[PDB]
Symmetry: D2
């Protein structure tokens, strides 16, 4: 059904881009029932066919790279340079799934009178729910491994930037036609998250939820999901630590990127910077000065470093948080300033009890805490989250100690928390999530082991 | 605690053996708080120390081998020969965790100008909840891997057979003291499961739930657990299939064991036998005849093949399921007899619709269905469960088709469903559970991955 | 160089296609010296660059697929349809090496106070020596993983079919130029194998020999290589076994392929067929009838099933072996006819004492033995070689017994010895070789482990 | 036999301890011939029996712990405390092999129409050749995995310290008797290395040579082994690098151990120390001072740090090596003296051209070169060997640069080259050897892969 129910916004011009369908809970149910009927076909789809489909998707994404990046610029406000990077990553993500279909290993276990070996089989229907920020690559990170493991897919992309997922869905439709697979094996269900996304969570016919998005929606999902496999990638306030012996020049450059890439709207964005008291002044000055020269505006402009936040309503919320932060004694050093949703790089020096140390802002808003080395781990671990952390030092013993004691799914050394190599296992501890993504790792999540025992 | 609150019953004689402590919900909360204070100590315990603790536990179990078996016989009603086997496997389980502490591999991922490697760290507190039927070995399968991965443990054992677990708790305590580790890293919480175990399920301080028991409680745990890792080993109505080309004597011997070991009170016991039409009379004759001459009586007697069911309550209820199955057209071929808790081997021929095809009796009750080959997979797959299945044939092509199409965590070829090699990955699909046990596989559930990235 | 020293022959027409350089021992020494200068550049070449180079080779091969297949037909005498298949396989090989550059995993070993991890580094100079029969894909199986593991290469191709390798060298040259890697990291050295190949084997600057070819030369290499890692893939008389219970139609069809693909000039070609006495007459009848209607002639012709042998001199030798087999009591069932190098499908019935049971002819000559089952393994195991074996049966227990007892690098059930899946470990035991190929496995051979120990 | 052919010497007192058999070439031939008769038996020994044999060996070694240690002191000259540590490691080695017989995994490879899996099978007869320095643990590292993988063993132990290998052979014979395995599966062959060892190398019935000893004999083997798998663990001159930012106290302590443990007679003993010139005098002073107070004397005395070298003849050669090093301009800082075979801790300051930089002395003789950081990698890499290297620094980037660029099988950071954890892959590159040991790795060398393909 192609109706026109819901407004899609250009976050920069605030103009309506187009209208798209918004499914009702009842239509979401129907879509799931239909998807269930195709389980047997996906389960039995030969390896070669899975490989071919995945390769073809990567091929289409490549051929439409520039179109897709423009779409990311317009719909998600993603600076075109960063947008081309997201697209190239989606290419690699589908490509890597194709090869894991061919290369995935099972095991044989020794036995005196038995041949015991394992087999991986699909969990069945994979319910994928993706966010606005990297909607192409994050969708690739769910779709590619779901297809690689013989799963049927119902997918709800973020209403905040659904257009690239719509183009990917058509790309997927295209590859399925090419290799004679009914189109019902993948299903893009657009609409209101608390309706269409929620139906996916609750519906007893979905076998696994793979969710990337807000902490609050994540935590709800654990309570509503029921008897399903659950994978969650939520946010964090990602602490990046700069010890006195850090290469300051490189630490600043790395932290400018980790702070302000996609206007700080990344689950692994710099959330707080903890800097040794003895170098704090020199760091703050260099950091502030490099952030001063960032070009802030139209994501379609090649020269643009930082574009708008996803909506006016979030920008307005961030403005409040920044106000609350100054009230608690935060010292504003840059920005704290917005035109509509275009939020300027904002830097504050705060203490450890600040609101910004407990709040993921999804914004180019960076709190710097000057501290002694002995307090750093305490402060770093003091949140409810545990996604990514980073440390800048040249000291072996200190780096080993911090790396072991930081309670996070990822610890980055001499680069910001923002780092993610796509083929690495990735995810959080504590309230930051459940399970690991990265194609090989997601494949293991999106399948069940069958143990086969042959008695001799 | 010195309290003597809750009767423990000998299922054969129905006598009280003694009274153990029954903790309140408050006492469970308080015990969980205590365990939290030792998280850092368990987390930082060196490999050599976890190895030593684990090996010393195995050593103490070996020394007390015969006593512990007697306790299984008296408390769980397990025939003494079968109890000795359970004890032996629990020894193997603790020694195997000890070796995996030292051998468990992490990985390095290639990268230009980055060193990327993984590290497993404990989930924190592991709440372990275990059943009555294999309380020593099933405890071992949660405790041993939890210790190997540096977790603190709160453990609730089944009230129906707790005494062996209390002896294991004393063994663990000795081990901990011997190697100067505080005793609060391991906690045994006895009392009512729906209070004490429920608190373990529900407490926000528990990081992971590992549950083995009933499906009713399993499903309820998925809704109550919330933000924790969840591993479930629930039951099943395990289908055992005998094709026309099977070795009959060997199939009968295998299925006798699968049906009657521990009086059918095993999550992987034979739930139904499906036998080809052309060999059905020969099979049923031979099968019934072997069942006849099994010694029913005192678990303490070396001669006993079948002992009592775990409670009178459950046995009376079993007798009701039999009468109902006869009333649906079930043909009784053996037994149906019962003295108090002691339930005699009972075999019936039924159709695919009989209540027994959909009920996990946990009793020595075996429904046998004759049918064509083309209908076997449908019947086997027709349930809500997916723990273990078994197929008896010499046909390569048929064995492969069945192994691929049987919707189960385990498929056994030319032995019954009741097979489990301890070092194999083990668990169910559908309503039969989540995640896999076996020390190596449980260790990966009971730890979280940390990805460490060094920028070169 | 640009010299025209050595005839290259069309095996079908016996005409000189062209003349290629024949390097002296001094010239091969020089190329090896030059290759040595580039070890550090290859050793330090980034993952990204190696992946690009490997993918670019695959891409150029794909674009010249037909030209390359035609060279194989004209030069190696390979039927055009089979030549297309080799080309296609060679593409997959380079592609899979590219992925393994990005994905190959190292390990971390637990230690009390140390970080212990591994790192793979090139052996240095890989000396690759390849055969006439699959010169493109077998070269790929040496070059692709050599490049993936940061080795410099010296490669001697067979003088019997060098042209496609000279085309592959130009392809490699193009990929190197495109990514700014010096040309001397790969060196094709043509000429007399006993001069040039021998120099690769003998020269102390070569770190590793990877040889595929004849037993006589392989065995010599083990005595002449000295201090280098050695990998050998020699031939064998590959026994294929047909039990009484086999699907005869599938067996015949499979065996026709394994017998007559590339006129039996493959290392894993069918060497003998052992057939149960009870089904022998029917198997022989069928096999002979299918082999009659094979189209024998010009490999450039789409119609041709079987083309000529690699040289007259070899065809002449086979004829004598066949005449010797007939003198020993062999019964001619088909063929035995020769036209220059074009040898016709030849089938004989023999006993185990017949010379053909002990001789790898590299020819479409198939000896059949009728025997009883319990003699089959003994006959199969009776040679000095042990590359591949096959067994056709629908019996689980027999297939398991035969799989375990066959002293072979590979055991194929229900297809002929000729099966090789490129991504599988491949190689032989006894005099059939040392080490395994298939890209992942070859990478392990062409690198050395470095264990790195960081004391905390 | 009961023959008394060969004097066994106590290297401290120079007394004959006893005479033992010296086999002739002919008797070595017969022992290999008998060994061959047992290939099938070993190859078919079930997992459980291999496990039981291995653990029973470990157990006997533990019960005879102190005895074996005194033997090591009396026969090998090994100080008693270091002898205990060698015994304790050998125990672990046999235990770990037992673990791996049960736990070693094979793989399954995906395929559209095939089930493809691997199986390891014994190489056949393993020829083990061991040295004098760790005759018990190094034997364990060859025998334990050889039993694990189903091989027959013929084993020549060093004539310089055979007594403990004789005791181990009896322990093995005991283990074999207990579980009804013929004694012929393991054969200890004493006598001249150039006769008995050589026949093991040359004999065509031996399938694999695992050799640990001198580079000169190792090099020989590579020319004489013929068509067998070859694994060599030779020595080297192991460079240990001390950077200006190193913890000097820790470096000194680590380097005293690495230099003087077992009087420098370990294949991974410190062969040279490279120290930054800005810290040379401080390091040299502290190092010489610590070396001064070591107790040199009788290995049986508990106080003894350094016992004698293995023979007067070797001690006399070392004396001449030291004089040559002084003649070339080396500055003697300590020692350079001997009392028969007792050689005192000897330390010299030399330049990079000194004979000590190129010679493995197997003696407590330590050359120190003061240099600049940027020449250190060149000097470390400038020998023909490549076993172990070490670097002392607290600088992350430098440790990584050195770790990557040091051409060695092992790199130790912040401990000396002597470090070996028994469960880590261990071995050298360049002339330091081939293949890796550590039980799990040795198992892979001492077995062949078999690929089994089932067509569906
Ligand atoms: O926005 P954001 O990225 O900051 O984070 P978010 O609100 O948590 O959204 C992440 C994803 O989850 C969906 N979602 C929102 N509420 C949901 C619910 N109650 N149940 C299931 N799915 C839900 C969203 O759909 P929508 O964007 O369509 O709400 C989006 O696709
Ligand atoms: O007996 P069975 O094996 O047939 O099945 P079961 O009742 O599910 O018992 C399995 C285990 O779960 C416990 N349990 C029972 N109800 C629970 C609940 N609501 N929440 C958490 N744990 C609970 C039991 O403790 P109890 O045996 O003490 O009830 C026992 O340790
Ligand atoms: O003929 P074929 O295919 O049956 O098998 P083959 O002669 O063993 O040929 C296999 C490969 O080995 C080379 N070769 C031949 N003799 C050699 C030697 N003595 N040392 C090193 N390499 C040698 C061959 O080069 P050539 O084809 O140039 O002899 C060919 O490239
Ligand atoms: O003295 P070391 O420990 O410094 O090192 P080594 O001489 O290389 O001796 C190591 C081992 O190799 C044996 N061996 C010596 N010459 C041999 C040969 N030509 N062929 C095969 N094995 C040989 C030795 O036996 P022997 O000790 O009996 O010579 C010893 O068991």
């Amino acid at each position: 059904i192609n109706r026109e129910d819901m407004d899609v916004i250009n976050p920069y011009s605030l103009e309506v881009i187009k209208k798209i369908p918004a499914l009702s809970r009842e239509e979401a149910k129907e879509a799931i029932d239909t998807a269930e009927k195709y389980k047997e076909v996906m389960k039995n789809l030969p390896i070669t066919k899975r490989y071919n489909i995945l390769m073809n998707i990567a091929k289409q994404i490549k051929e439409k790279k520039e179109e897709l990046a423009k779409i990311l610029a317009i719909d998600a406000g993603k600076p075109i340079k960063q947008a081309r990077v997201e697209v190239e990553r989606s290419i690699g993500t589908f490509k890597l799934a194709a090869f894991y279909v061919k290369e995935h290993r099972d095991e044989v276990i020794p036995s005196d009178d038995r041949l015991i070996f394992t087999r991986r089989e699909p969990v069945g229907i994979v319910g994928a729910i993706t966010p606005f920020n990297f909607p192409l690559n994050l969708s690739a990170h769910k779709i590619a491994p779901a297809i690689a493991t013989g799963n049927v897919i119902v997918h709800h992309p973020s209403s905040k930037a659904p257009l690239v997922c719509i183009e990917l869905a058509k790309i997927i439709e295209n590859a399925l036609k090419k290799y004679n697979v009914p189109l019902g094996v993948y299903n893009l269900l657009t609409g209101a998250g608390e309706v269409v996304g929620d139906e996916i969570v609750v519906n007893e016919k979905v076998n696994m939820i793979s969710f990337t998005g807000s902490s609050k929606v994540g935590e709800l999902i654990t309570k509503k999901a029921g008897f399903k496999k659950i994978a969650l990638e939520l946010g964090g306030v990602n602490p990046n630590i700069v010890l006195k012996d850090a290469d300051l020049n490189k630490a600043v450059n790395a932290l400018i990127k980790g702070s302000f890439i996609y206007a700080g709207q990344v689950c692994i964005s710099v959330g707080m910077i903890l800097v040794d008291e003895s170098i704090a002044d020199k760091f703050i000055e260099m950091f502030v000065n490099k952030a001063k020269v960032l070009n802030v505006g139209n994501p379609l402009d090649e020269k643009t470093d930082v574009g708008p936040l996803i909506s006016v309503e979030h920008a307005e919320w961030v403005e409040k948080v920044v106000e609350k932060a100054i009230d608690e004694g935060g010292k504003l050093l840059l920005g704290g300033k917005r035109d509509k949703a275009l939020f300027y790089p904002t830097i504050l020096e705060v203490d450890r009890d600040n609101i910004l140390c407990k709040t993921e802002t999804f914004a180019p808003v960076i709190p710097i805490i000057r501290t002694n080395e002995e307090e750093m781990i305490d402060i770093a671990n003091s949140t409810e989250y545990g996604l990514h952390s980073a440390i800048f030092t040249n000291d072996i013993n200190k780096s080993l100690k911090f790396a072991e004691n930081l309670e996070f799914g990822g610890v980055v050394i001499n680069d910001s928390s923002l780092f993610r190599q796509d083929n690495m296992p990735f995810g959080g501890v504590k309230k930051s999530g459940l399970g690991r993504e990265g194609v090989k790792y997601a494949m293991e999540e999106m399948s069940n082991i069958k143990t086969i025992i042959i008695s001799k």
